[PDB]
Amino acid sequence: SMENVAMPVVDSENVSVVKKFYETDAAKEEKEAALVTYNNTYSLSKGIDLAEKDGKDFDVSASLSGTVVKAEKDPVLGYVVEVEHADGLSTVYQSLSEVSVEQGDKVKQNQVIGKSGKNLYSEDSGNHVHFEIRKDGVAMNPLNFMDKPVSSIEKAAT
C-alpha cells in the first residue's frame, strides 16, 4: 500500500520483456507469442518474462514490500519466490538461478531477492525471470500495473 508497483529488477533499463501475459483478445500473433512451450505441451503465460540484451545474469528484486512466503528450487521452474503483500496481493518470481531470501524474510521494494536463470519450463525465454502479480491467487497482466499505485490493482474486477 502507498507504494507503486515496480519492475522486478535493479537495472530496469538493461532488460526487455521477452514474453507477455496471455490476453484472449490480442491478435493471433500476440497470443501465439504469449504461450509457454514445454514439450508438446503449451500453457498460457501468467506473467511477463524479462531478459537482458545478451541474456546475461541479472539481479531480480522485490517489486513491492512484503513477506516471503515461498522460496524453493523446483527442478522444472528453477528457484521460485513468492512475496506476500497487502490484501491478497502477492508477486511471483521464478526461473531464478539463485535466491537471496528464505521463507519468512520480510523484504522491501527493490531489495534484491535472486538472480535470473534459465529453466526447463520456458527454455524459449532463455536466461530470464518470470514475474507475476496475483490477487487472491489469480494472475493479472503485470504490464497493466507497472508504476501504478498499489490500489489501481484492487480496483479490478468491476
Partner: protein, 115 residues
C-alpha cells in the same frame, strides 16, 4: 494399453464418487446449513465443469481432431488432443475454444499426443 479410455474411465469413477458424497452431505440431517449450501454449490459447479468438458471436446473434434480429452475441474484446465503435428498455431486455435472467464481465472494447458 490406451491412455484416453483409461483416463475417461477413472475420471468417471472419481466423478461418481464425488457426486455421491456431495449428495450425501446435502441430504444429511447432521450437516449444517452452511455445509449443505457449499456441498450444493460444489455439486452444481461440477455439472457445469462436466458440461464444459463435453462441449469443449465436441468443439475440438469438429476442428479436425480425431479425439480430444478435457479436464476442467481444478485451477488449470488440461486438454489433451490426439495429433502428430503440434504448433503454436494449432494450440492457440484450441485455446480459443475455451471460455473467456476460464482463461481469465485459470491456466489452460494443451498437450498433443502421437496418434
Amino acid at each position: 494399453d490406451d491412455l484416453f479410455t483409461t483416463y475417461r474411465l477413472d475420471l468417471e469413477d472419481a466423478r461418481s464418487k464425488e457426486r455421491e458424497e456431495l449428495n450425501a452431505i446435502v441430504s444429511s440431517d447432521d450437516a449444517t446449513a452452511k455445509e449443505k449450501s457449499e456441498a450444493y454449490d460444489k455439486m452444481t459447479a461440477l455439472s457445469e465443469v462436466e458440461g464444459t468438458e463435453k462441449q469443449l471436446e465436441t468443439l475440438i473434434k469438429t476442428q479436425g481432431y480425431e479425439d480430444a480429452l478435457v479436464n476442467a475441474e481444478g485451477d488449470k484446465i488440461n486438454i489433451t488432443v490426439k495429433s502428430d503435428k503440434h504448433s503454436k498455431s494449432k494450440a492457440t486455435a484450441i485455446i480459443d475454444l475455451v471460455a473467456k472467464e476460464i482463461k481469465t481465472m485459470k491456466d489452460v494447458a494443451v498437450t498433443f499426443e502421437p496418434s
